[PDB]
């Protein structure tokens, strides 16, 4: 195995695949392509780098971070000549020379084979929107494993992401212009993080394939495959207020800063704040075990009946931070029902937060 490749053509692929043999990258020269693979047994990332310079076929496994560090550590425009010799991988560039340990390619684990059942193409920017709109609402380490992940749902010509932790929910829907079957899968959060990281911001489309226990996304020269999660994901339709008689509108940043200040004097553990809505007015209050108090009064557009309702303020703040927009619409029922929060100018995403008593 021998190849010579420019630093900049190696860095991005290396970064993508890098994030005992599990600590190594499988390298393969075959058919004029170098392929770099990393895996944690649950998911797998593959990068394909065309080899334009002379090269010899073969496969090995090298420590992931050390090899990435060497290449990144090399000067801008460095040519990185690499060859297997005995039990070692030699890496050379200018007068920099490195000899890395290896493990047999034979020992590198392969994920089981599977069959694609649902497929679709979408702009990269669409997948970026879908994930960034919802990611933060995933549970962290809930004993309900299906909540530590993101629902990816197809319906009609829309792909939809949903995330909830049982107290708050995010949902986002985007048209992709293809006749899709009705279907749902749960991608574990680690897969979601990786899928988000492979989106370079370029105009290269993404290709999604969904199996019965797997999901695969192809963009450019990268192929990411992850296992899915078991269990019954909740239905976001149940969660959206069936009918809202109470509509609030306010600037996102004003609301954010008011809530952020009130957060200061909220209970450290429970984070509770009270909301008082009345004719064109929102009042936010907070207090902690030390009987310290915060009060915020804001001009809003609000026409319904007066009501008071409590929240975990970090749940509200997460929502407003995730809305990168001028105006926020809030839709209410009563003091003990969930609230729906949206961008005033766009219904693409909706955020639902259950109150505190």
């Amino acid at each position: 195995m021998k190849f010579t490749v420019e630093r900049e053509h190696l860095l991005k692929p290396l970064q993508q695949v890098s994030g005992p043999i599990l600590g190594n990258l499988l390298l393969q020269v075959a058919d004029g392509t170098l392929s770099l693979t990393g895996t944690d047994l649950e998911m797998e990332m593959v990068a394909r780098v065309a080899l334009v310079q002379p090269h010899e076929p073969g496969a090995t496994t090298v420590p992931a971070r050390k090899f990435f560090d060497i290449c990144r550590g090399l000067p801008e425009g460095a040519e990185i000549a690499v060859q297997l010799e005995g039990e070692r991988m030699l890496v050379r560039s200018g007068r920099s020379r490195f000899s890395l340990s290896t493990l047999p390619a034979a020992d590198f684990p392969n994920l089981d084979d599977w069959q694609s059942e649902v497929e679709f193409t979408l702009p990269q920017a669409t997948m970026k929107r879908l994930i960034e709109a919802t990611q933060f609402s995933m549970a962290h380490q809930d004993v309900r494993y299906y909540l530590n992940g993101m629902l990816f749902e197809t319906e009609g010509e829309e792909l939809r992401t949903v995330a909830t932790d049982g107290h708050r929910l995010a949902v986002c829907s985007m048209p992709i212009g293809q006749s899709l079957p009705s279907h749902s899968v749960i991608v574990p959060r680690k897969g979601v993080i990786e899928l988000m990281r492979m989106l370079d911001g370029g105009d290269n489309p993404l290709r999604v394939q969904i199996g019965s226990n797997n999901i695969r996304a192809h963009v450019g020269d990268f192929i990411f495959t992850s296992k899915l999660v078991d269990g019954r994901f909740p239905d976001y339709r149940r969660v959206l207020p069936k009918n809202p008689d109470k509509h609030l509108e306010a600037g996102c940043d004003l609301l954010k800063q008011a809530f952020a200040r009130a957060a200061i004097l909220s209970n450290e553990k429970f984070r509770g704040v009270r909301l008082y809505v009345s004719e064109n007015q929102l009042k936010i209050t907070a207090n902690n075990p030390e009987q310290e108090e915060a009060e915020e009064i804001l001009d809003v557009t609000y026409s319904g009946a007066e009501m008071e309702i409590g929240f975990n303020v970090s749940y509200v703040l997460d929502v407003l931070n995730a809305l990168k927009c001028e105006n926020v619409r809030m839709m209410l029922t009563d003091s003990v029902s969930s609230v729906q929060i949206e961008d005033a100018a766009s219904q693409s995403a909706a955020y639902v937060v259950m109150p505190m008593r």
Binding site: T164, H167, R168, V239, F270, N312, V336, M354, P355, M356
Partner: peptide, 5 residues
């Protein structure tokens, strides 16, 4: 904190 579901 109330449960969403």
């Amino acid at each position: 904190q109330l449960a969403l579901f």
